[PDB]
Amino acid sequence: LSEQLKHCNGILKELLSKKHAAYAWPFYKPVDASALGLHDYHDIIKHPMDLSTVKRKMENRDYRDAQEFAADVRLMFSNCYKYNPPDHDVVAMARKLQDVFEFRYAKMPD
Ligand SMILES: CNC(=O)c1cc(C(=O)N[C@H]2C[C@H](O)C2)cc(Cc2ccccc2)n1
Numbered sequence: 828l829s830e831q832l833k834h835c836n837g838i839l840k841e842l843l844s845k846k847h848a849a850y851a852w853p854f855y856k857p858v859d860a861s862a863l864g865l866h867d868y869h870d871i872i873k874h875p876m877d878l879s880t881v882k883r884k885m886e887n888r889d890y891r892d893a894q895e896f897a898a899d900v901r902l903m904f905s906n907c908y909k910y911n912p913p914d915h916d917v918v919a920m921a922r923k924l925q926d927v928f929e930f931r932y933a934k935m936p937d
Contacts, residue, residue, distance in 0.1 A: 828885075834893065834934075836885055850924055855877065857875055
């Protein structure tokens with residue numbers, strides 16, 4: 828990985844770490860719409876994204892730069908903000924994990 832992709836991989840490891848598990852857990856795996864009774868999820872969310880998919884893409888060297896990595900992490904949060912009412916617990920958890928993401932992503936090495 829490049830220096831910027833190593834910074835991205837470090838962020839990914841932190842988002843998956845026990846440190847953030849209390850609010851990160853809804854983003855660990857793809858939303859199982861059927862299991863959760865969310866029969867409109869795939870009509871509203873055209874591009875599902877989650878941290879296990881980001882991890883697989885990082886492991887497969889799919890991401891060519893930090894911008895591509897950040898686009899998937901932000902897509903995951905955007906899906907949450909699009910599908911859910913803004914007062915839902917999952918949105919509070921998305922905002923908290925996105926705060927962790929944005930502040931560390933901003934420390935990208937130049
Ligand atoms: C990324 N996951 C989700 O978007 C999601 C959605 C919904 C859900 O039921 N949404 C509907 C829309 C509105 O009518 C309520 C539930 C969960 C699981 C969860 C529950 C409680 C707390 C944290 C997660 N995750």
